[PDB]
């Protein structure tokens, strides 16, 4: 029993919004539509599939769509390891920081790709009717 225009899956309501925003703003936007709404989280291949298809039908084309996969900013606690030592000295052209993930039209919106949070892209909201 989801609002008009919204779709249902696994007793959850979902809606894709063709309104480009920042991770932060889209996330904020989703939390205003209904108690505990959020950028969509994807917990199964089946769900991943129910979302790309809702993207495919309601969003007029765009290369990326925001999902709620956010960086925890715990890097100093998540130090990677070489096939032995610790990953401190590093040397990459780490342009700007990309602490966000979105869905890529390239892979029919089924896969995730690390992207800059500040980028404006359509999004998919989600929330449970039982609050």
């Amino acid at each position: 029993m989801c609002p008009p225009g919204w779709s249902s899956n696994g007793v959850y309501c979902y809606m894709l919004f063709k309104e480009p925003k920042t991770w932060d703003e889209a996330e904020k936007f989703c939390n205003k539509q209904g108690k505990d709404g959020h950028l969509l989280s994807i917990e199964s291949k089946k769900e991943e599939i129910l979302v790309d298809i809702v993207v495919s039908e309601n969003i007029g084309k765009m290369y990326k769509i925001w999902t709620g996969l956010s960086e925890r900013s715990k890097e100093q606690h998540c130090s990677s390891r070489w096939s032995d030592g610790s990953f401190f000295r590093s040397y990459e052209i780490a342009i700007r920081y990309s602490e966000c993930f979105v869905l890529e039209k390239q892979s029919v919106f089924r896969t995730w790709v690390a992207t800059p949070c500040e980028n404006t892209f359509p999004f998919m909201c989600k929330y449970p009717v039982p609050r």
């Binding site: 950028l39 291949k45 709620g68 996969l69 070489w82």
Partner: protein, 123 residues
């Protein structure tokens, strides 16, 4: 300090190979060359310069694998709705570290492709 055909530097031995392997095989091949050997790792004991200036002139000097696969982990990413990050659909093959000699810096690339390699084991 090192076996024949292996360069010495700061207590480590380095040998260059001209084979072309994917990350995974490269690591395995390295472990096989000598005890405690692995794809070269860099911490900047000025190994870079050395590795590329001495433990490289004995190589095609391009693109060598780096022993670091920075695969996405649960430790630093999560859902805004606090749901656990079980199912994941991010690319795992992406992110194998690599050194591009022409750019004189590291880079992340498909773990599935092929590259030269420099194995390293502490003496």
């Amino acid at each position: 300090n090192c076996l024949p055909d292996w360069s010495v530097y700061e207590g480590y031995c380095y040998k260059v190979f001209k084979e072309r392997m994917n990350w995974a095989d490269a690591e395995k091949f390295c472990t096989k060359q000598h005890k405690d050997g692995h794809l070269v790792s860099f911490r900047n004991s000025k190994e870079v310069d050395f590795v590329i200036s001495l433990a490289f002139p004995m190589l095609k000097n391009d693109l060598v694998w780096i022993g670091l696969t920075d695969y996405w982990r649960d430790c630093n990413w999560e859902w805004s709705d606090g749901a656990q990050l079980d199912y994941k659909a991010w690319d795992n093959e992406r992110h194998c570290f690599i050194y591009k000699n022409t750019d004189n810096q590291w880079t992340r690339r498909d773990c599935t492709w092929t590259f030269s390699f420099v194995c390293k084991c502490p003496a």
